[PDB]
Amino acid sequence: AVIKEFMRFKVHMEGSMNGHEFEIEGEGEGRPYEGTQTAKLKVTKGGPLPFSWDILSPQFSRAFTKHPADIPDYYKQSFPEGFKWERVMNFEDGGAVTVTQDTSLEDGTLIYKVKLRGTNFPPDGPVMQKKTMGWEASTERLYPEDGVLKGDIKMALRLKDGGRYLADFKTTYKAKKPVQMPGAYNVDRKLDITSHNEDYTVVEQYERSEGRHSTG
Fold first, then answer.
1. Pairing relationship of beta strands 83-91 and 164-175 according to DSSP bridges
2. Rounded to an integer, what distance in angstroms lies between the CA atom of residue 114 and that of residue 101?
3. What is the CB neighbour count within 10 angstroms for residue 211?
4. Which family does it belong to?
């Protein structure tokens, strides 16, 4: 009831990558039951970023995933209070990122607060040299544990040279009130940068995601 067929969000991120501090502010919109959303982000401090935007893009919205009727939606049920999440991203070349997020609702608008710390990225690696070209489509394997939902993703960034750059994502999602827990299930997702200015200080992105049962 609280999550309408069309919803907007506002987001603020404070982060650091290999010690370079930055801030991002943005706004987004989408269709939570259709699984689609777009966001427009601006770098407000530390721009232009000396690293790939692709590290940031998965940190900007779990209310917007399409679910079949028989899978309870952990995220939508958590409103109006909302949910938190905490993530580690471990990259194949030793780069590591921790992210924490709070999702709440104010005056009918979703409010996202993100903190990000990335370290140990090789100075000549694809992240610090901006050689990545977006994420491959992915499948997050979600499972319940003790009132929280945990997710694992094998993620891959495309490289400008045609190669790939792999990461493991581990996330815990925590509703702020009791909800009906789903069984373990999968979320298929595609995230794309759809526009940007020359130095990626203004960036638009789009995500489509849909939950489904595992086939085994």
1. antiparallel
2. 4
3. 21
4. Belongs to the GFP family.
Cβ neighbours for 87, distance < 8 A, ≥ 6 positions apart: 59, 97, 98, 99, 100, 101, 169, 170, 171, 172
Q: Find the domain containing 68 and state its range.
A: 1-216
Q: Could you tell me which of 155, 168, 157 has the C-alpha nearest to residue 134?
A: 157
Assigned token pair, 48? 């232009």
**Which DSSP letter does residue 187 get?**
E
- What DSSP designation does 136 have? P
Q: Residue 115's beta-bridge partner residues?
A: 14, 100
Resolution, Å (one decimal): 1.5
CATH code, 102: 2.40.155.10
Structural domain count, the chain? 1
**Way the structure was solved:** X-ray
Report whether 194 contacts 169 (CB < 8 A): no
How far apart (Å, rounded) are the C-alpha atoms in residues 23 and 131?
22
**Residue 37 contacts residue 28 (beta carbons within 8 Å):** yes
Which residues are CB-neighbours of 100 under 8 A, at least 6 positions away? 84, 85, 86, 87, 114, 115
